[PDB]
Amino acid sequence: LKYICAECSSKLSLSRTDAVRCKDCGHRILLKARTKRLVQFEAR
């Protein structure tokens, strides 16, 4: 899971050229997969 590309939740897990135009979609803009890393906030 490394890229999104679309309304589809295609977790491309891209290394190089695995149909960036994702298979269920036809998009070619490749959005980038908000992290799993834990984030902090402050509700002051």
Structure tokens at 18: 């695995």
Distance (Å, whole) CA 19 – CA 35 = 22
Amino acid at 12: L
6 near Zn ion (CB under 5 A): yes
14 near Zn ion (CB under 5 A): no
Q: CA separation (Å) from 44 to 39, 40, 41? A: 16, 13, 9
CB nearer to Zn ion: pick between 10 and 14:
10
- Residues in touch with another protein (CB under 8 A): 4, 7, 9, 19, 21, 26, 28-35, 37, 39-44
- Residues engaged in binding Zn ion (CB under 5 A): 5-6, 8, 10, 22, 25, 27
